[PDB]
Write an enzyme that holds these catalytic residues in place. Structure first.
Site: not given
Lengths: 267, 336
Positions: B31, B33, B35, B38, B55, B146
């Protein structure tokens, strides 16, 4: 209401950071080779006053100053004063605690200015030289601090429960200002590493009642809690105020700071 | 540091577990993003053949966002909320790594598989666990902020087979300030704070998407978002004064009045919407959905009250394993 407010009994504070007094004093014997017991508590008072001074300058709330004060105590509970200079650790603790809140951000330049200003104007009796550390030193310290605390950042304090008790008595006008300051004064001692926050709050409120001569016995009786442990907390509070009397921070702290063990340099 | 004690420095350096030593992950990015990024990881030692999610948090050091996520995850413990197993602090590059138990599935992929063409036992069980996990958070005054299908993970083969794991919470929002398919109307009309109710609205949207496989408030790419509001009203109808008295207190109410007319949406309601997507409006599911998708946030039921709804007492019961012992047909995550 604040994050994890009702979670104390399952919290990392309670499960990991309520220490045994036996374990505390055994690790303190490292620093007792250089400092006496009396000098060690005197140093703890000094650095509590330094962290309060820094918080007041950055206009942080008492609860953030507390969290910072605890982070400091947790570090030196395990490690010696030689390990990281407590002049670096104090503002690093204030810096990390401020970031745990999502309301407002303390900036780099503003941290260094605050440390610099506070040592120069409020603690020049202890420190002749300017605050020597810069932000790279704070950021490095932050990492070591975070490692030792096992990333346990959320910290519970006596203020929240204190407030509930005075509201319960219906004596917020009379007793809250005094009880509140006594809670601040308890941070001059090891109480926050040894007892849960609510027991400290009760003890503070008892001292407040005795000082102000309000009869709270019928209220205190109506509480379901170990009164022995509260009395233990009152004794430290009572002793703290006789330590306060007999201690001249300003006349003694420069010498005591010289007695602190210095770190080993690199080879 | 030139003024940290050396023995202390080298000792900690000697004993510090480094993420690269413990775990194999290079090239297993799963993943990406704004933030942190991952990775699907396995341990280098053969102590266990389970998968973990590593992460790496974006940027050096501990930002407010980093701080608060670490702070809270370190306290939170509930089966339906993602568990921080370990924090690695890498001293050389100043990067922080968070280790979690690996969730093979998520509601975004599950729903998209079905849309590329859900059993009702599974839908109810998903919803119940989402509610169980949010309710925990909410009782501890932690908002999500979110909520959406991609942030509702679901565990695969292993001892937690089919358990929901809520993930990717908005831990940092400056002053709790929001200042769009899953966003409650109050945010769209300029609500100044996140609330328990806003999360709940989000859960209602997810439940409608679980029943139909289609985002209930699906909208094209656009504080105040006109077209997203247009879609809310096409599905729900336009709220009467009686339904949301405080709507006049919203900062964008005057804009709403300029831009929209009540009679535009006279045909429109949640009953009529759901009938098109083959869901009965006299079912317990619908009556629960309608309570979650209430326009006035003070008229929205709470997560606790949702869990008490008789929908969860109706055959079939919610099950711990969301897949109900049946074979998981959903494909394993693709690497990025």
């Amino acid at each position: 209401d604040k994050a994890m407010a009702g979670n104390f009994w399952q919290s990392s504070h309670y499960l990991q950071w309520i220490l045994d007094k036996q374990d505390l004093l055994k690790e303190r014997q490292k620093d007792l080779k250089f400092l006496s017991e009396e000098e060690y508590w005197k140093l703890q008072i000094f650095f509590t006053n330094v962290i309060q001074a820094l918080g007041e300058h950055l206009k942080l709330r008492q609860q953030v100053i507390a969290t910072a004060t605890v982070y400091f105590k947790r570090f030196y509970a395990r490690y010696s004063l030689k390990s990281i200079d407590p002049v670096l650790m104090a503002p690093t603790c204030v810096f990390l605690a401020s970031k745990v809140e999502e309301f407002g951000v303390v900036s780099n330049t503003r941290l260094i200015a605050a440390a610099t200003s506070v040592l120069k104007t409020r603690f020049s009796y202890a420190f002749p030289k300017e605050f020597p550390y810069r932000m790279n030193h704070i950021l490095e310290c932050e990492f070591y601090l975070l490692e030792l605390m096992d990333c346990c950042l959320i910290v519970y304090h006596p203020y929240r429960p204190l407030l509930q008790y005075v509201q319960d008595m219906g004596q917020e006008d009379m007793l809250l200002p005094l009880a509140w300051r006594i809670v601040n004064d308890t941070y001059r001692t090891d109480l926050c590493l040894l007892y849960p926050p609510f027991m400290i709050a009760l003890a503070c409120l008892h001292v407040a009642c005795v000082v102000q001569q309000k009869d709270a016995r019928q209220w205190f009786a109506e509480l379901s809690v170990d009164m022995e442990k509260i009395l233990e907390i009152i004794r430290v509070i009572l002793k703290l105020y006789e330590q306060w009397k007999n201690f001249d921070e300003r006349k003694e702290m420069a010498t005591i700071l010289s007695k602190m063990p210095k770190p080993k340099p690199p080879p | 540091d030139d003024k940290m004690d050396y023995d202390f420095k080298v000792k900690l350096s000697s004993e510090r577990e480094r993420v690269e030593d413990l775990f194999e992950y290079e090239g297993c990015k799963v993943g990406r993003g704004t933030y942190g990024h991952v990775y699907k990881a396995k341990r280098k030692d053969g102590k266990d053949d389970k998968d973990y999610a590593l992460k790496q948090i974006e940027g050096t050091g501990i930002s407010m966002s980093a701080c608060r996520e670490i702070a809270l995850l370190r306290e939170l413990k509930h089966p339906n909320v993602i568990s921080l197993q370990k924090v690695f602090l890498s001293h050389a590059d100043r990067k922080v790594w968070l280790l979690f138990d690996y969730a093979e599935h998520d509601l975004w992929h599950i729903i998209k598989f079905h849309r590329a063409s859900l059993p009702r036992g599974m839908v109810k069980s998903l919803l119940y666990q989402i509610l169980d996990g949010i309710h925990y958070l909410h009782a501890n005054w932690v908002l999500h902020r979110d909520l959406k299908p991609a942030n509702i993970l679901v565990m695969g083969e292993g001892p937690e087979r089919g358990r929901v794991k809520i993930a990717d919470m908005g831990f940092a929002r400056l002053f709790n300030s929001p200042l769009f398919w899953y966003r409650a109307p109050e945010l769209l009309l300029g609500a100044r704070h996140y609330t328990k109710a806003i999360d709940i609205w989000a859960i209602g949207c997810i439940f409608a998407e679980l029943l139909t496989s289609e985002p209930i408030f699906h909208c094209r790419q656009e504080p105040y978002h006109h077209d997203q509001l247009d879609r809310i009203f096409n599905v729900m109808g336009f709220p009467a004064d009686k339904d949301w008295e405080d709507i006049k207190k919203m900062p964008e109410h005057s804009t709403l009045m300029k831009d929209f007319r009540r009679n535009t949406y006279t045909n429109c309601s949640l009953i009529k919407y759901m009938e098109k997507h083959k869901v009965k409006p006299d079912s317990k599911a619908f009556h629960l959905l309608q309570k979650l998708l209430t326009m006035d946030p003070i008229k929205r039921i709470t997560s606790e009250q949702a869990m008490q709804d008789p929908y969860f007492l109706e055959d079939p019961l919610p099950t711990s394993d969301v897949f109900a012992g049946c074979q998981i047909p959903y494909p394993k995550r693709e690497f990025l």
